[PDB]
Specification:
Length: 16
């Protein structure tokens, strides 16, 4: 899970 993912939604969906 990637924490700093809010301003440009890209890094939120693929974090393990």
């Amino acid at each position: 899970p990637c924490s700093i993912c809010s301003n440009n939604p890209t890094c939120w969906a693929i974090c393990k």
